[PDB]
Amino acid sequence: SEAVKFLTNETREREVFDRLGMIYTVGYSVC
């Protein structure tokens, strides 16, 4: 309940993983 409520208000995680090039290139650079 409480974990799902803040994720449904700001839906940013689903939009950045839709753009697959600009997400795994950002994580691989900071290692």
Contact of 24 with 30, CB cutoff 8 Å: no
CA distance 29 to 21: 13
In order, the DSSP letters of 1-30 are -HHHHHHHHS--HHHHHHSSHHHHHHHHH-
CA distance 17 to 31: 19
Nearest CA among 9, 3, 7 for reference residue 17: 7
This entry's atomic model was obtained through: NMR
**31 DSSP assignment:** -
